[PDB]
Write an enzyme that holds these catalytic residues in place. Structure first.
Site, PDB file in Angstrom:
ATOM      1  N   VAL A  84       0.843  -1.179   0.000  1.00  0.00           N
ATOM      2  CA  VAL A  84       0.000   0.000   0.000  1.00  0.00           C
ATOM      3  C   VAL A  84       0.894   1.250   0.000  1.00  0.00           C
ATOM      4  O   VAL A  84       1.819   1.346   0.803  1.00  0.00           O
ATOM      5  CB  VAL A  84      -0.964  -0.013   1.199  1.00  0.00           C
ATOM      6  CG1 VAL A  84      -2.022   1.084   1.053  1.00  0.00           C
ATOM      7  CG2 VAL A  84      -1.619  -1.388   1.340  1.00  0.00           C
ATOM      8  N   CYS A  85       0.644   2.190  -0.914  1.00  0.00           N
ATOM      9  CA  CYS A  85       1.339   3.485  -0.877  1.00  0.00           C
ATOM     10  C   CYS A  85       1.214   4.091   0.506  1.00  0.00           C
ATOM     11  O   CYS A  85       0.126   4.081   1.091  1.00  0.00           O
ATOM     12  CB  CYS A  85       0.764   4.456  -1.896  1.00  0.00           C
ATOM     13  SG  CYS A  85       1.333   4.123  -3.560  1.00  0.00           S
ATOM     14  N   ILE A  86       2.325   4.601   1.035  1.00  0.00           N
ATOM     15  CA  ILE A  86       2.333   5.110   2.404  1.00  0.00           C
ATOM     16  C   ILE A  86       1.475   6.378   2.581  1.00  0.00           C
ATOM     17  O   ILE A  86       0.874   6.570   3.637  1.00  0.00           O
ATOM     18  CB  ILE A  86       3.776   5.244   3.005  1.00  0.00           C
ATOM     19  CG1 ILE A  86       3.716   5.392   4.529  1.00  0.00           C
ATOM     20  CG2 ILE A  86       4.565   6.381   2.352  1.00  0.00           C
ATOM     21  CD1 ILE A  86       3.335   4.081   5.263  1.00  0.00           C
ATOM     22  N   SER A  87       1.381   7.200   1.535  1.00  0.00           N
ATOM     23  CA  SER A  87       0.616   8.444   1.615  1.00  0.00           C
ATOM     24  C   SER A  87      -0.880   8.257   1.863  1.00  0.00           C
ATOM     25  O   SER A  87      -1.559   9.198   2.280  1.00  0.00           O
ATOM     26  CB  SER A  87       0.822   9.307   0.366  1.00  0.00           C
ATOM     27  OG  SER A  87      -0.072   8.932  -0.656  1.00  0.00           O
ATOM     28  N   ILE A  88      -1.404   7.067   1.585  1.00  0.00           N
ATOM     29  CA  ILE A  88      -2.819   6.819   1.843  1.00  0.00           C
ATOM     30  C   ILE A  88      -3.005   6.264   3.259  1.00  0.00           C
ATOM     31  O   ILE A  88      -4.106   6.265   3.792  1.00  0.00           O
ATOM     32  CB  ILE A  88      -3.513   5.918   0.753  1.00  0.00           C
ATOM     33  CG1 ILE A  88      -3.610   4.466   1.187  1.00  0.00           C
ATOM     34  CG2 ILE A  88      -2.841   6.041  -0.629  1.00  0.00           C
ATOM     35  CD1 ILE A  88      -4.307   3.630   0.191  1.00  0.00           C
TER      36      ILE A  88
END
Length: 157
Positions: A84-88
């Site tokens: 999972v992209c960390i920004s989300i």
């Protein structure tokens, strides 16, 4: 810092997030953590046991960790690799606690703005455009949920 991670680990083991158990992979290595995730009791994840990993840079918390599910997960916002992209997980507004809290959040309501998995996203939408009449997106979660019993016999609880 090792201090920052030591402080964060201890703080998460002293006051757990409900449905998440965090441990070190190798207790001699603070940079890689393992997360156990117990599916929330009134979602389609209920009864599930999901496993994910956290990897932190040597300059943490200046730079964010990496998040990746080990369990295969059908989800708009999770890649096939489990990433999972960390920004989300750490959105615009302690770090790992908020990260864990985004996981519950993302599991409950996917984010179809720009999805990791489009097939999962197209299916999730069908599940909305019909008021839950197209069970397909919901069906895969269930299959994945009960497949996790195998993993939670391999260790348990």
């Amino acid at each position: 810092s090792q201090k920052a991670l030591l402080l964060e680990l201890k703080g998460l083991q002293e006051e757990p997030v409900e449905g998440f158990r965090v441990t070190l992979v190798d207790e001699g290595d603070l940079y890689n953590w393992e997360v156990a995730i117990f599916g929330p009791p009134n979602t389609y994840y209920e009864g599930g046991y999901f496993k994910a990993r956290l990897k932190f840079p040597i300059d943490y918390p200046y730079s964010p960790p990496a998040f990746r599910f080990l369990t295969k997960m059908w989800h708009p916002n999770i890649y096939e690799t489990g990433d999972v992209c960390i920004s989300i997980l750490h959105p615009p507004v302690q770090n790992v606690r908020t990260i864990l809290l985004s996981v519950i959040s993302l599991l409950n309501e996917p984010n179809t703005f720009s999805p990791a998995n489009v097939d999962a996203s197209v299916m999730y939408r069908k599940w909305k455009e019909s008021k839950g009449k197209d069970r397909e997106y919901t069906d895969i979660i269930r299959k994945q949920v009960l497949g996790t019993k195998v993993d939670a016999e391999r260790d348990g609880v």
